[PDB]
Structures are given as C-alpha cells and as structure tokens.
Design a protein around this ligand. Structure first.
Ligand SMILES: *[C@@H]1O[C@H](CO)[C@@H](O[C@@H]2O[C@H](CO)[C@@H](O)[C@H](O)[C@H]2NC(C)=O)[C@H](O)[C@H]1NC(C)=O
Ligand code: NI
Length: 228
C-alpha cells in the first residue's frame, strides 16, 4: 500500500495526487490542480487480477486525469516518490508505460489510451532480490528515463508496482498503477507505436502473475508486453 505523492523531472519538484485531495473534494467540491491522476482507493490499495479487464486497471480506482500537465524534455529522468510511509512489499517487479493523448491529457478518455512499456525490472537471479526491495532501499524512489527518441506530444506515464508476496494463489498478485500527465518536448523524432490497451496488459494466469515467490527463482518472465 502506498501512492506516488510527488515526482521530480531532472531534479525539479512536481506535485502528485495525494489522498488529502480526495477528502478536500468530498468536503468542498474542489481540490488543487495537479499532474497526478485523481483516484479513489482510500487506503492506497491495489487492483487485483479479477480486475485486469476493467477500467480500474488503466490508472487505478475510478481514476480521472490530472487537471494540469507536467513537462519534460525527451531523455529526462523522472523519479517517482512513493509514500507517505516506507513501501511494505519487498517481493515483485516494477514496470512503467507511456501513452499519447489525442488533444490535452487533462480531458482524455482513459479507456482509449494505448500503452508502450518503457521500463521493467524484476529479480536479480544471483542475489534473489526484487526491484521492490531496491525501491525500499532507495527511499521509496524509482528512476525512469523518458526515451531520448520520443517525439514531442502530450503523454501519460503509468508507473506500476506488482507486489508478489501473494502471487502463488489465483487472484493473489497486487497491482499498484499510478498515472501522471507529462508532456514531452525536445529533439526526439520517433512516434510511439500502436501499444496495448491497459485491459490487455495482463491475464490472471500469466507466468509472472501467478508464480511462487518463496522458492529460488532462476528464470522469471516480467509481465506485460515487450520493452520499447
Ligand atoms: C513527496 O512525497 C513524499 C512521500 O510521501 C513525502 O515524504 C514524506 O513526508 C512526510 C512528512 O514530512 C514524512 O513523515 C514521511 O516520512 C515522508 N515519506 C517518505 C517515504 O519519504 C514528501 O513530504 C513529499 N514532498 C512534499 C514537498 O510534499
Ligand atoms: Ni500494500
């Protein structure tokens, strides 16, 4: 359990969506305009395999686009900061996707977004240590590079932890997707390819979704489509 509360682009601070804003909205009808998506999981919980074909897998529970967008040059590093507490969950991979928006991302139909994998990290076979343990050891921070070749445009980045402590059972994998609006500028010239609807990323029986984390692992298939 946890959420992306803020993030940096080339060191520069950007405000993310925090749970306090959900309660602001309940009380007053409005909340601060931020690049992180609004979402309604009040515990900072997860989406389950039985929800892999539902709108909630796109950007988490009842999610809606942030009212503004951040911005970054292609080749920039994003550092997602998870919180408010230390990440609980030392087992599992970390993946990040990007999708382009037709028009502003602030008003996009999330269900029409098509995702391209730009980062993935699993288990180090020699240490048996997962990417999520590395996240805990890096102060809840994860670095993702925006591909240098990516052409300017309005994009959404979908950063996701797949906590695998329960993955040996059907429906046990816990997905924590978090979306942020980040427009891209600069000197990249390549269009994003066709990509994959979020509802087609994962199946409950995929080899890296349903597996035993409590035994020595010599081969692991990180879930989702191929790295771009
Ligand atoms: C960016 O988000 C992080 C992560 O939640 C915030 O860091 C937390 O800050 C609180 C309040 O000071 C501390 O009690 C926690 O220990 C921190 N958690 C972690 C994991 O670092 C940080 O405050 C946010 N930045 C801003 C400016 O709001
Ligand atoms: Ni949790």
């Amino acid at each position: 359990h946890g959420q992306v509360q803020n993030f940096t682009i080339n060191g520069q601070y950007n405000q993310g969506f925090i749970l306090d804003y959900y309660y602001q909205k309940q009380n007053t009808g409005h909340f601060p305009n931020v690049a992180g998506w609004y979402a309604e999981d009040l515990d900072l919980g997860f989406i389950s395999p039985d929800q892999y074909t539902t709108p909630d897998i796109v950007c988490h529970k009842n999610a809606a686009p942030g009212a503004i967008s951040a911005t970054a040059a292609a080749g920039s590093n994003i550092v997602f900061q998870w919180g408010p507490g230390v990440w609980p969950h030392p087992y599992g991979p970390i993946v990040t996707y990007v999708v382009e928006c037709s028009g502003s991302c602030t008003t996009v139909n999330k269900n029409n977004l098509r995702w391209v994998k730009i980062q993935e990290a699993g288990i180090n076979y020699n240490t048996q240590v997962w990417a999520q343990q590395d996240l805990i050891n890096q102060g809840n921070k994860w670095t993702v590079k925006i591909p240098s070749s990516l052409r300017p445009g309005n994009y959404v980045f979908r950063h996701e932890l797949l906590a695998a402590h329960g993955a040996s059972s059907a429906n046990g994998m816990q997905n924590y997707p978090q979306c942020v609006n980040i427009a891209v500028t600069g000197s990249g010239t390549k269009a994003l390819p066709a990509g994959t609807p979020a509802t087609q990323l994962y199946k409950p029986t995929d080899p890296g979704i349903l597996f035993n984390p409590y035994t020595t692992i010599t081969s692991y298939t990180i879930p989702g489509p191929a790295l771009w």
